[PDB]
Amino acid sequence: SHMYYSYGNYEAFARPKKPENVENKSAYLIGSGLASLAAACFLIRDGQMEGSKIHILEELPKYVVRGGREMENHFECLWDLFRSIPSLEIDNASVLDEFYWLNKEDPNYSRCRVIEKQGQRLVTDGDFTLTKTAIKEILDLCLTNEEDLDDVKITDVFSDDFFNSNFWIYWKTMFAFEPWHSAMEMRRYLMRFVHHISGLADFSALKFTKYNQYESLVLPMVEYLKSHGVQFEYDVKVEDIKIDVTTSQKIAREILIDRNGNAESIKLTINDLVFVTNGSITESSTYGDNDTPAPPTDELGGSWTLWKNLARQSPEFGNPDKFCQNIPKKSWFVSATSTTNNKEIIDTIESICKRDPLAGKTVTGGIITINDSAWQMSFTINRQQQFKDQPENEISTWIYALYSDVNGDYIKKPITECSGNEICQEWLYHLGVSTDKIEDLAKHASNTIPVYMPYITSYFMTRAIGDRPLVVPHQSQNLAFIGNFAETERDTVFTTEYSVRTAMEAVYQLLNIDRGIPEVINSPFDLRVLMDAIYELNDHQDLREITKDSKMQKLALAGFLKKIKGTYIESLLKEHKLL
């Protein structure tokens, strides 16, 4: 046991000893992603490794919004990391200090969630409209083991009652889930955010940064790492890492890189740690403009080629083909972001979200789902402005579509064939804007940049156990896997927390840092949390109202209330407004 999980304030504020033999250890980190930079920060702080021994290998040499970066308070590893990171906006404060102070003065909540029939709000908005069978299937999915859910789709565990409910409309749009996605990952998502079911439709439990994650999270970490002398090597293309797999131990021996076009090799010892971010969801992302579509592609990038080369060496390094291959053509591929300063587009937006987009505060509270759209278009507007040099009179909205190969409503073309204005054409169509001024507002009054990510749905692909390698593989001495494609316990991918948690576990295991890693929050194992979930799932109903029709549950409930009458259980039932 090279690590142990923990919770509470004891292991939270505790600093570990400097681990043994660190001063003769180095670290090479492939990529400059969020998980890679988090691992370097943990090596500096918790591992007490000097910055000159840490190398960041970056492929690239020395307005687009990557939306969907929702955050919540129980990102235990993220706030453990973003504590010693000083901020760049205000002095004598951390990244968490600004995030705490900004989310307490302007709480995030959505006054409108789903609209349909070109602008009109959904009549059953706020309610989940989950039937008894839909709630049963939700419980059945959570009560099934993770081992029994290997290569199981969402449609294999849910019926047509679940998909017709408003709960699925919120769930499929908040997390960009698809019906052909992993049931293991969805089951992890239901258990992780079971305490946010009350704040699910109105987004009251969601927390947002002042800007995008690049300048709110990545840039503060870059400034922190550069202050400690962390070496950043650029123009480095990592082909493959030579691993010798013996029956007793596995050591990274050598890395083949392409340093500024010249292929050369770095030698490795047992002390020289290697951190690999296998796979990438932003790789091979073609871009478009307001007049031409983003060209579709399926070219495997550097991150996917490295994982394929590593997987051939050992079977327990994971299967990269289960994520980067055979992605359905109906999956989410194209996302667009539109920037405008035109008044009547903003006025239409204000008429739907009931808040001023130029006020500088929470605008939409999150995303807005177009239920009638054939593309399953969903758009969001964050606290404008999300950028530094962006003018104060301009707003930036982010648009993504779930289905890809279906013709749109106003434009009879798929999202893959529509240019930047044409995506903005149908977006204005569903906002209630008339079909006469719709054309010139997109082509001239707004600038929309499409982007085609062919791997933006890879983390939710159906997988088995062992398809994702362990964060530190078994019997591994200096090789670690970080990012959203590394296997850990009970955590949800496509979150900033998952990348940070994998970074923390990799550093703590390889360096044998004897400090408790903060476990995933115990909401699914909490009596109070599970009771609040039952109340919220069936549209704010007491136990008498939930079982008012079924006789088998009514008899069982009557015996239950008889045995708990005048007890602390009944007090728990009443204070959670279930009785």
Added chain:
Amino acid sequence: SHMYYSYGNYEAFARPKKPENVENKSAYLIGSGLASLAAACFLIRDGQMEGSKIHILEELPKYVVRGGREMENHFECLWDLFRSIPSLEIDNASVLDEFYWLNKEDPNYSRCRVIEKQGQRLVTDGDFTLTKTAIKEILDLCLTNEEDLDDVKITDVFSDDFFNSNFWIYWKTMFAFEPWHSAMEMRRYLMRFVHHISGLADFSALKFTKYNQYESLVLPMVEYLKSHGVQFEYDVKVEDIKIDVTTSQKIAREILIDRNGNAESIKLTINDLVFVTNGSITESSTYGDNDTPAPPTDELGGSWTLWKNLARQSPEFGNPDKFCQNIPKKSWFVSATSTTNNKEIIDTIESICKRDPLAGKTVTGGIITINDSAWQMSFTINRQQQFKDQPENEISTWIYALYSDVNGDYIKKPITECSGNEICQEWLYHLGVSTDKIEDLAKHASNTIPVYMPYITSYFMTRAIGDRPLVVPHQSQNLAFIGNFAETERDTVFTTEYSVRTAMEAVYQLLNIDRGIPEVINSPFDLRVLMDAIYELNDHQDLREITKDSKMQKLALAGFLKKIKGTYIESLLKEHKLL
């Protein structure tokens, strides 16, 4: 709602804003106890109050062991406080840093717990020997509401099966419980440490400081407070505080003090906060020596007189007479500490606890209970030495007796009438030392100092709701109550955490500090914790073994396993070794 509870790493590392109008606010703190000094530290750190505006009023002008200061990892408020406090032993570290590092290199566990028949270990040691009815009564106490347990004794909720079990032997000695004590406080104790039931007999869950709490906790806080310029006024005897109770608000207007023998008054405004530690368990503590007993007394001290004077002003300031009056004469009154360097006394101690007392590490793992002693004597030896100038060849043991008016085994006198050597006489009697060298080893080879605390059992006295005032009373502007006699939610008195938690809540409510106060740990509301408790309570038995005799439970269990077969519940049952 002037405060809110929270948990997790978000509110743990978050620093609050400087609260409004603080720079015109002052603070007067009565007493220099653990709770009082904790409140001053919170005012400096979280309240950002300058030290010159904080006053500590101390009655006193400018080897004894106060044993029983067990600590555990989930003292959430204590580690929140002892984080910014720098240590005095090692540099560039906090009090928590040393505590974390010392308790990970030398884990605390007891190789012997209960001895009887003059030295021999209990045959059923480690086991709880709780019957089915005893486990039923334990569950019934935890499942009853706190409101229904007003003025309820321990004997009123438990039967003779519970008191004959080894669980009660450990419980009545770890926490110095008595059969005539508050069932509310015991129910809080069972729910608080329900996750430590596995580590209850062997003390594997207990954590200890390097020295006594005065030098490990109080002195680091004193040095921290003096570095910030906190004013310490000495020779100040607080008689009463003038409170005007209107229908809308209550304000501390004036405090009557006796400054160095001269009675004078300090005026108060709404901004001038007042923190009162009502009651004291160490007050009116008479001392003895190796030849004379500690003289018994019942004189109300300054802390009890202040609470009585405050209680007359308003009914919701609590009832001090329910704790300081009518304490039974069989209750714990006399404690002794014995210091020796004689070899054969140490050798006898090593022969029982199986560890060297002079090694500098964990010696007894906690306390040792004498089951055959009429006094219910229990003695402990911590990591020697517990003091600074104490020689390396000397050990210091702490002896307390639960029953007080009963004659001892070797000495036919009560503990109240026995001198320092005579307490050491019967202690050596139960260690297996022969009845020939027993006398001169206590009178000449050891020095034992008795102490008579008449209020060392007041916090466990039977109480109703409102007997203890709220930490901040309702409609109170500048008056707060801190310490073990203030009422808070779900926390256990006679712990360092309770004094710190009351200090944190008082500072956060009076100053309107908008940061989450860490709640009491959610062990009673955790599915995993409750399942481990069931396994440990019935002496490591599976559900088939627990219900192997009762037919009503056997039928219900068979239906339960049928409904959970091949589910995540069954996985939870197996991984908690309950199935």
